[PDB]
Structure formats: structure tokens, C-alpha cells
From TrEMBL, chain A:
Belongs to the RNA polymerase beta chain family. It comes from Sus scrofa (Pig). This is DNA-directed RNA polymerase subunit beta. The chain holds residues 180 to 239 of 1251 of the full protein. It is found in: Nucleus. RNA-dependent RNA polymerase that catalyzes the extension of a non-coding RNA (ncRNA) at the 3'-end using the four ribonucleoside triphosphates as substrates. An internal ncRNA sequence near the 3'-end serves as a template in a single-round Pol II-mediated RNA polymerization reaction. May decrease the stability of ncRNAs that repress Pol II-mediated gene transcription. DNA-dependent RNA polymerase catalyzes the transcription of DNA into RNA using the four ribonucleoside triphosphates as substrates.
Automatic annotation (TrEMBL), chain E:
It is found in: Nucleus, Nucleolus. The keyword Lipid metabolism does not apply. Zn(2+) 1 binds at residues 8, 11, 25, 27-28. Its main location: nucleus. Keywords: DNA-directed RNA polymerase, Metal-binding, Nucleus, Transcription, Zinc, Zinc-finger. The lineage of its organism: Eukaryota, Metazoa, Chordata, Craniata, Vertebrata. The keyword Zinc applies. One of its GO terms (cellular component) is RNA polymerase III complex. It comes from the Eukaryota. This is DNA-directed RNA polymerases I, II, and III subunit RPABC4. GO terms for biological process: transcription by RNA polymerase II. Belongs to the archaeal Rpo12/eukaryotic RPC10 RNA polymerase subunit family. Zn(2+) 5 binds at residue 27. Zn(2+) 2 binds at residues 11, 25.
Length: 60, 139, 17, 66, 47
């Protein structure tokens, strides 16, 4: 569907998992013969989904 | 006969269902509506094209800003979706439309054309909405 | 449930506006 | 949830007295005089208004529509 | 000729929902709906 916040009560009613997506900055850095090197960065690569505790600092 | 003509007559309770249904310019184009002019006189106009007004108006619960390209023989102008009547084709209005078509030079659509057009509505009704139409509807 | 009019719901005219 | 219709013990109607009781607490009364002014003599009937927790006020916040 | 009338969980609008259909409200893309009350005879002893 179209992106939107999941509300805890919808998560409860639909047997979903109240969770945030989780992302990280990864530098793919590499070097080879000839002193060819690079450090291409993949900003916000998805890592997983982390379950949120209700009424926390990161809850809706 | 104004009785066979009422089968392809689009009433007011039918438009409401199809405000956002695509293929719109392919089912309604060829039928006749009972539009209002205004005192209780009415004229049978011809659904020619699908136009849109800059005027948003509420039709009961529902709201639709679209227009209708109607024409009574030669007199054509813009129309809104609110002024259509649920009344069927009467005798005096049926002969009046016959005289507006004989006076304009337009051919009267053959009865076999009306019989193959009235069934497009019933198949479009019973249409399984399996494709990406609910999305465009809520948009 | 196809045309439940029972006439109608006061159809507005075009030459009234 | 909502004030009982009758004192469970004796059977006196207390259902009509809850609005009035809160009205007598809009006035500056002790609950003891509010209960008395409404005419609740028995210590059965008096518990109904003291002890009633009005949760219908909270359930009413969960609108169905509008 | 009964289309099975659902109520949207967030719009509160009635929705006509036959078989083989996505359970979506047609007003806004919400995904929870409730069945409306039965038409059967509901009778209670005040007891
Ligand atoms: Zn549909
Ligand atoms: Zn008592």
C-alpha cells in the first residue's frame, strides 16, 4: 500500500508486529593492486525491524 | 416508443455509483438522460462526451465537480450531474425529442443499438473490481 | 438495491440558478 | 460503568440520583450532606453513590463516528 | 441480492463487499472493517 504510520491498536487488531524499520550508514570501502581504492557509502541501508515498547521515546 | 427508451435512461441513483469508475466515457456515451431546464418542462438530451466543471457541488452525500456534454438536437451547452431527473420518458417529451431530432437532421438510433447498449450497464454493474481501480478511487 | 427512489428527493433545475 | 438502577442490598432506586449528587458536589457540600439531601437514609443506599465510579464518561470518549 | 454491508474501522462509512475482494474502505485506504448488526430477532428477558 501507500506509506503510513502503524498505530498500536491497528497492530493489535491485525496480528501485526509493532516495529520500526531500522537503517544504518555503511561505507563499502575497498582497495586493490595499483593503489585503486574507494569508499562508496550506502546511506540508510535497511538492517531489520525492531519492536517498539508502547509509550516509549520512539513510540507514536 | 418511450418505454424501450427508458431502459437506457440513466437515473440519478446510478450515477452516484460510477462517479469514479473508469471506462466512463464508454458506457454512458450513447444513452439518454432526463435533464432539467426549467417550469415542469423537460427535454431528452444526448450524452455526447465527458466534461469537467470548475464547480464542486454536493449531491446528497457524495460530491462531484464533473460535467456532461449534453445536446438536445442542436442546442448544446454544459451540464452538471445534479439537474438530472429520476422521471422516466413521458409521451409529450418523447415526441418532443423526436421532433428535435427530425428537425436537426440527426438519425434516430436504431432499436438494435439501444438493445446492445442497455446491457453494457448491467455487465458494468456486476463487474469484479480485481484490478487497480480501488486505488484511483480513494485518490 | 438498484433504484430506490419512491417523486424523489427534490431534483434541482438548471434554469433555477 | 454506569450508576446502578437500585441499591443492590435494599432495592431503593438510586439511578436518578447520580446527576443530582454531582450537582450537589458542584455546590460546596460534603458528600455526607449530599447523600442526606437526596434522602439516602440507609448505609446500603449511601454506598451506591459514594462508591460508584463513573466509567461511561471515559467510554464516551471512544467515538464511533465524529 | 444482498452485498454484505461492512463498516470502515476509521471512516465509519458503509462499504459493499462481495467475495474475492480486497478488504479496503472505498473512502480512504484503511484495512479494518466490522460487520453491521444482524437482522434476526434479538430478544432479551430483562433478567
Ligand atoms: Zn466496486
Ligand atoms: Zn440501599
Amino acid at each position: 500500500g501507500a506509506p503510513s504510520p502503524m498505530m498500536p491498536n491497528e497492530a493489535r487488531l491485525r496480528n501485526l508486529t509493532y516495529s520500526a524499520p531500522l537503517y544504518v550508514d555503511i561505507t563499502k570501502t575497498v582497495i586493490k593492486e595499483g593503489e585503486e581504492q574507494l569508499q562508496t557509502q550506502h546511506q540508510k541501508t535497511f538492517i531489520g525491524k525492531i519492536p517498539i515498547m508502547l509509550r516509549s521515546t520512539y513510540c507514536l | 416508443l418511450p418505454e424501450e427508451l427508458n431502459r437506457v435512461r440513466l437515473s440519478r441513483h446510478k450515477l452516484e455509483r460510477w462517479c469514479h469508475m473508469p471506462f466512463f466515457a464508454k458506457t454512458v456515451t450513447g444513452c439518454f438522460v432526463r435533464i432539467g431546464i426549467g417550469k415542469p418542462v423537460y427535454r431528452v438530451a444526448e450524452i455526447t462526451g465527458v466534461v469537467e466543471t470548475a464547480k464542486v457541488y454536493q449531491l446528497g452525500g457524495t460530491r462531484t465537480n464533473k460535467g456532461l456534454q449534453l445536446r438536445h438536437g442542436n442546442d448544446q451547452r454544459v451540464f452538471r450531474l445534479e439537474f438530472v431527473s429520476n422521471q422516466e420518458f413521458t409521451e409529450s417529451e418523447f415526441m418532443k425529442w423526436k421532433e428535435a431530432m427530425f428537425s436537426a437532421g440527426m438519425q434516430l438510433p436504431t432499436l438494435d443499438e439501444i438493445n446492445k447498449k442497455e446491457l453494457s450497464i448491467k455487465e458494468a454493474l456486476n463487474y469484479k473490481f480485481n484490478d487497480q481501480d480501488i486505488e484511483e478511487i480513494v485518490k | 438495491t438498484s433504484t430506490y427512489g419512491r417523486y424523489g428527493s427534490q431534483t434541482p433545475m438548471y434554469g433555477s440558478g | 460503568m454506569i450508576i446502578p438502577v437500585r441499591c443492590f442490598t435494599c432495592g431503593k432506586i438510586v439511578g436518578n440520583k447520580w446527576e443530582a449528587y454531582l450537582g450537589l458536589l458542584q455546590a460546596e457540600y460534603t458528600e455526607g450532606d449530599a447523600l442526606d439531601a437526596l434522602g439516602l437514609k440507609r448505609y446500603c443506599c449511601r454506598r451506591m453513590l459514594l462508591a460508584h465510579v463513573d466509567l461511561i464518561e471515559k467510554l464516551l470518549n471512544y467515538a464511533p463516528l465524529e | 441480492q444482498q452485498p454484505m454491508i461492512y463498516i470502515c474501522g476509521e471512516c465509519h462509512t458503509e462499504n459493499e463487499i462481495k467475495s474475492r475482494d480486497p478488504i479496503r474502505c472505498r473512502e480512504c485506504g484503511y484495512r479494518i472493517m466490522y460487520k453491521k448488526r444482524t437482522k434476526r430477532l434479538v430478544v432479551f428477558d430483562a433478567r
